[PDB]
Design a protein around this nucleic acid. Structure first.
Lengths: 300, 202, 50, 50
RNA sequence: CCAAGAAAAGGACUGGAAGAAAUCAUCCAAGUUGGGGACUAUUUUCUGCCGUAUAGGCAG
């Protein structure tokens, strides 16, 4: 290893905002009511006579895991470059793109608000494509998707596979979903972290406030595609260097097992050798996923 | 002209909101046996931060209050060293009164209440024959401090919360207590002495 | 610890979050374009030692 | 309002130096010792005479 | 069974008068802070009624 090594993030959303349409104007925000009772109570629900609620966010994808942002060691750099390319030419970006793409179309980024009478998801991109999932309530992590839907997963996978692997393509997606709702259904936006509770909003250009979901909360949902441990797929974990599992309060790739990122980072010379003899194993899939969610890998 | 007795909780881990609810339920049951009675509930350890680890009952009829004290629940809880009980004695003549009014208006702070109110309003319009056209209020309200007590429903499948406020007494009219020995904002006037004094007795 | 002994930490102790305070900046909803501006002056001042 | 500092704009405008090692690559910010921040090194170390 | 044993320093006061620190003086030159991120969790606020009514009062 070496003293300085960093990657930046290769995939990121902006934030999500809730709103509805009227006959008089196209963008009316969903608002939150507060009573000072400081120590307050507050509430948010769809108001009477609005039949459906809209949620929207934007996504940029960048081929930025091909090269270290900073590296202080010429030998570490030579290897990391050789590895990313050794992988790229055998495929594998398709696999990562398939996993990311599946999560967008499924709709899990809606977290606790998935319980609707029918959710429709529409996607537009900067290359001129449009995708349409008429009903997002039925698509599993594991299983065969119904016809015409399986197909759009392949088409979206292809655009993203490119966005992740070739530079100088400026790829944007614009994701809007519609929630068909109940009579006065409660809505669950992001909460504020404090030292009673408060909810998060954003300001509109006209001064009104609106309910929202934070950027990283959308992001945490998209990248939850780690099921390469213990030969038991279950449900996937949010990619983490130690395999953290918040629900059970544990860690699946505890350093004690030899299965964490840092042990694996030191075997790069051996992986490149294998790729040259090539089948891609779980060990290199994990590593590539972490490099995409870049951060500090230092003080070796 | 007034008698009282007090109960204190001995255990350091006691949950005041859960436990207080049982004493009120007993009072209610007693009220059902003998409709023509009046017994008030007081919180002599009331604070702005918490409800306190003690409860007291106040009334005017000594012989009746003794009968209440004899209720089996209280006797069991004492025997197992959960409760410390006092005896019935006369209320000191050197104190001030408080109301302990309960406020149901606070229900409107929660989504469940708004939903029910509107559902009824829609249905109610059919008699009028006009289209349902509800009109909402503004975004800011100000309310006073209140504490919660956990309550079970009477012969049903529900549970809910009582919201208690403390108001200072002002004298007028004649009195009456609610089924819980609590005061109401209107047309249920009563008061209790604020016996935070002489509490060294338990 | 020095890539040698992994530290004593019990499994559950890493499932905890690490809160932080940060400043951030986003373009508000419905703005069509963002502008950026600056001025530049150039002087013929390398001809002679200050 | 959010801004970009004067010398931060400046560092970008003066990023002009591909005269070392007879191989242009990418240009460096002009520096008396040829500093290269991305690689944490220096291209015109006094030991070279350059 | 302590270089042993015992010990009243007390009384009285009046330091005052005068005064002029000023003149000038120059801190300058360049400079990149920066890469990652789930506050919701085994939580209590649910059901009816009066009323033109998201007003305002009541039973569980």
């Amino acid at each position: 290893l070496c003293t300085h090594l960093s990657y930046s993030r290769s995939l990121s959303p902006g934030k999500a905002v809730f709103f509805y349409k009227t006959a008089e104007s196209d963008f009316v925000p969903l608002r939150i009511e507060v009573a000072k009772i400081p120590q307050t109570i507050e509430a948010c629900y769809v108001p009477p006579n609005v039949d459906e609620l809209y949620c929207r966010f934007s996504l940029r994808v960048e081929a930025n895991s091909m090269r270290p942002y900073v590296c202080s060691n010429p030998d570490v750099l030579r290897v990391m470059i050789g590895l990313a390319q050794a992988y790229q030419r055998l495929g594998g970006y398709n696999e990562l793109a398939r996993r990311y793409s599946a999560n967008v179309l499924r709709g899990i980024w809606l977290w606790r608000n998935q319980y609707t009478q029918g959710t429709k998801i529409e996607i537009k991109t900067s290359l001129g494509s449009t995708y349409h999932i008429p009903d997002a309530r039925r698509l599993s992590w594991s299983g065969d998707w119904p016809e015409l839907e399986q197909k759009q997963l392949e088409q979206l996978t292809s655009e993203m596979a490119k966005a992740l692997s070739q530079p100088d393509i400026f790829w944007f997606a614009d994701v809007t979903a519609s929630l068909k709702t109940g009579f006065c259904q409660e809505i669950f936006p992001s909460q504020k972290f404090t030292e009673s509770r408060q909810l998060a909003t954003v300001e509109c250009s006209d001064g009104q406030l609106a309910a929202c979901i934070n950027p990283q909360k959308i992001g945490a949902a998209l990248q939850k595609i780690d099921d390469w441990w213990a030969n038991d797929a279950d449900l996937p974990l949010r990619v983490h260097e130690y395999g953290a599992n918040h629900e059970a309060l544990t860690a699946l790739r505890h350093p004690a097992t030899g299965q964490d990122f840092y042990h694996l980072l030191t075997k790069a010379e051996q992986f490149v050798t294998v790729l040259e003899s090539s089948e891609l194993p779980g060990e290199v899939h994990y590593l590539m996923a972490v490099l995409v969610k870049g951060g500090l890998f230092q003080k070796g | 002209n007034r008698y009282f007795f007090a109960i204190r909780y001995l255990s350091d881990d006691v949950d005041c909101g859960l436990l207080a609810g049982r004493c009120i339920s007993i009072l209610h049951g007693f009220r059902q046996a003998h409709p023509g009675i009046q017994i008030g509930v007081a919180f002599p350890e009331w604070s702005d931060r918490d409800l306190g680890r003690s409860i007291a009952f106040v009334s005017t009829n000594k012989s009746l209050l003794e009968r209440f004290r004899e209720r089996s629940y209280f006797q069991v809880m004492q025997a197992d060293n959960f409760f410390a009980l006092s005896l019935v004695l006369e209320v000191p003549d050197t104190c001030q009164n408080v109301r302990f009014i309960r406020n149901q208006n606070l229900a409107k702070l929660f989504v469940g209440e708004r939903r029910r109110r509107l559902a009824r309003a829609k249905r109610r319009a059919k008699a009028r024959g006009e289209a349902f056209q509800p009109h909402m209020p503004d975004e800011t309200k100000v309310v006073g401090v209140f504490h919660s007590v956990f309550m079970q429903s009477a012969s049903s499948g529900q549970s809910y919360i009582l919201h208690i406020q403390k108001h200072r007494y002002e004298r007028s009219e004649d009195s009456g207590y609610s089924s819980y020995g609590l005061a109401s904002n209107d047309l249920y006037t009563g008061y209790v002495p604020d016996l935070g004094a002489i509490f060294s007795t338990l | 610890d020095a890539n040698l002994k992994p530290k004593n930490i019990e499994r559950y102790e890493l499932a905890y979050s690490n809160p932080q305070t940060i400043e951030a900046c986003y373009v508000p909803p419905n703005v069509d374009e963002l502008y950026c501006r600056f001025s530049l002056r150039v002087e013929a001042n390398s001809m002679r030692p200050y």
